[PDB]
Structures are given as structure tokens and as C-alpha cells.
Design a protein around this ligand. Structure first.
Ligand code: AD5
Length: 272
């Protein structure tokens, strides 16, 4: 990772929090191409000091996203490690997270918008699958909107996938359980079971989110009831906008080997 000086980072407004993290908008002072000085908007992700013993997995998650270059993956700019502070410096994405956007605009996002975003997510996941790279935390909170639909020029929305955060292979079991039904049943059974098939299941859950106006599936269930939902081999209810319900259920197959390839998923989306 490129090291960024603490003195070159300005922290501004809080945008939210993740698992053991706090997230801020900020500014990076840098020398750009041609030696020109710039002050650039950036996303600053800060690992909680109390959880600094997770720093390796915190940074490894961003490393994954920088292994490859792709138009649908958020860019990492560098890191700042100062004292007990572990900071990831990333691309600031203008319109924020997809789950909040879907809720704010639930009454003016139509099925073609949802389909285009699903296709873009599937394109990203196909790229990762071809590179045998596991993401491990596909969810609408980890999708960011670079630009909105422009109905007048026929320009679609454009999304990027963000880094997965600290891996479910090291997180406390209670956090994995709270993340049902994004975490697949085999990973609840054994977090070592994390596999490319993991991301097909989570992709299904994320499609459910995309079709549900920012509702969170099973949010009314406490953790014990979420665990029992998997024990009973239940499926999520069809979204009211049900056009992708079959694909959701095909991806959320309790048998990992039966989940479709992302090539097959894209074929299904393109046939709609
Ligand atoms: C990598 N990770 C990113 C973000 N993650 C946030 C993490 C906390 C919840 C909101 C998204 N936000 C980013 N930008 C935001 C842009 C607008 C935002 N909102 C717009 C709608 O009104 C609320 C703020 C929020 C975050 N960019 C980014 N790159």
C-alpha cells in the first residue's frame, strides 16, 4: 500500500460506521500528475482503536480490492498508520450507499433501474469469479452509487463494489449470526467454509435488497431466530417487485454446488 502522511489528511464529516470502524469524508493533499498540487475529496475508514488487533484483516480486505483493477471496484488510494490509528484512504463515491439510496428513492426507482444495477453487480462478481477472488461480504451497504440515472440522456446509474471489511473468517460468531441471511448457511456452520460459492448466496441476498426498497431481509428476527431460519431451510419471501425472485432463490441455494455461475446469472438477467 501507498503510505499517506497524517499531515496530508483532513478529517471532515462522519458518514457512518462499519464493523469495528468509523467512516468520514475528508481531504487529501497530494502531488498529482505533472507535479501539480491537489486537494482531493477522499473516504477515510478508521479502525476502532479498541479493535486494532484486527488491523491485519482490516487492511487485507482493502488489499483484495487492489489486487485487480476494474471499473466496478472502488479504488484504494493508500493507508495511514499513525500511533494506534489505522486508516484506509479510498475513493469518495458521490451518491453514497445503495441501501440508503434505495430507501430514500423507493417510490421512483423502477424495475429497469434495479435490473441495470443487478447486471453491474453481476459483472463485478463475474470478474472476481474468473480471478478466483472471494469478496466475502456482498451486500447493498457495500455498493456505492457513482452516478444517478439520467432519464433525459438515457444514461444508466453506475455502481461500484466496496471492500468487504474485516473477514467473516476472523469475526466473532455473534456478528456472523447477526449477518444472516447475507452470510450463507455453510459459513455459519464453519466460517472456514468461505468459498466462491459464498458470494453467489450473498449476491442473492443483495438482489433481494435491491428489489425491496432498502428493507433488510429478516430484520424482524433476532439472532437466535435467524439461526433457526437456516436450520429449517427457509427461503426469503418474494420481493413485492418479484421480477428477480426466481434468481434470488436460485442463488440462495442451501447446496453450495448448485448455485449458478456468474456467467449463468448474467445470462438470466439479460433474458429478462
Ligand atoms: C467507499 N466507501 C464509501 C462510503 N461509505 C459510507 C459508509 C457509511 C454509510 C454510507 C456509505 N461512502 C462514500 N460516500 C458517501 C456519499 C454520500 C453519502 N450520503 C448521501 C446521501 O445522504 C447521506 C450521505 C454517504 C457516503 N464513498 C465511499 N467510498
Amino acid at each position: 500500500f501507498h503510505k499517506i502522511r497524517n499531515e496530508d489528511l483532513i478529517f471532515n464529516e462522519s458518514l457512518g460506521q462499519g464493523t469495528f470502524t468509523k467512516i468520514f469524508k475528508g481531504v487529501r493533499r497530494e502531488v498529482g500528475d505533472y507535479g501539480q498540487l491537489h486537494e482531493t475529496e477522499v473516504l477515510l475508514k478508521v479502525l476502532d482503536k479498541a479493535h486494532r488487533n484486527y488491523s491485519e484483516s482490516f487492511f487485507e480486505a482493502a488489499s483484495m480490492m487492489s489486487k485487480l483493477s476494474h471499473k466496478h471496484l472502488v479504488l484504494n488510494y493508500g493507508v495511514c498508520v499513525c500511533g494506534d490509528e489505522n486508516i484506509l484512504v479510498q475513493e469518495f463515491v458521490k451518491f453514497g450507499s445503495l441501501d440508503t439510496y434505495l430507501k430514500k428513492n423507493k417510490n421512483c426507482i423502477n424495475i429497469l433501474w434495479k435490473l441495470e444495477v443487478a447486471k453491474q453487480l453481476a459483472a463485478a462478481m463475474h470478474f472476481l469469479e474468473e480471478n478466483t477472488l472471494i469478496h466475502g461480504n456482498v451486500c447493498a451497504k457495500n455498493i456505492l452509487l457513482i452516478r444517478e440515472e439520467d432519464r433525459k440522456t438515457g444514461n444508466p446509474p453506475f455502481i461500484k463494489l466496496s471492500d468487504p471489511g474485516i473477514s467473516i473468517t476472523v469475526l466473532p460468531k455473534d456478528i456472523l449470526q447477526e449477518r444472516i441471511p447475507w452470510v450463507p448457511p455453510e459459513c455459519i456452520e464453519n466460517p472456514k467454509n468461505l468459498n466462491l460459492a459464498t458470494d453467489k448466496w450473498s449476491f442473492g441476498t443483495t438482489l433481494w435488497e435491491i428489489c425491496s426498497g432498502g428493507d433488510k431481509p429478516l430484520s424482524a428476527l433476532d439472532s437466535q431466530r435467524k439461526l433457526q431460519f437456516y436450520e429449517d431451510r427457509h427461503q426469503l419471501p418474494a420481493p413485492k417487485a418479484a421480477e428477480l425472485a426466481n434468481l434470488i432463490n436460485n442463488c440462495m441455494d442451501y447446496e453450495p454446488d448448485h448455485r449458478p455461475s456468474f456467467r449463468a446469472i448474467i445470462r438470466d438477467l439479460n433474458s429478462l
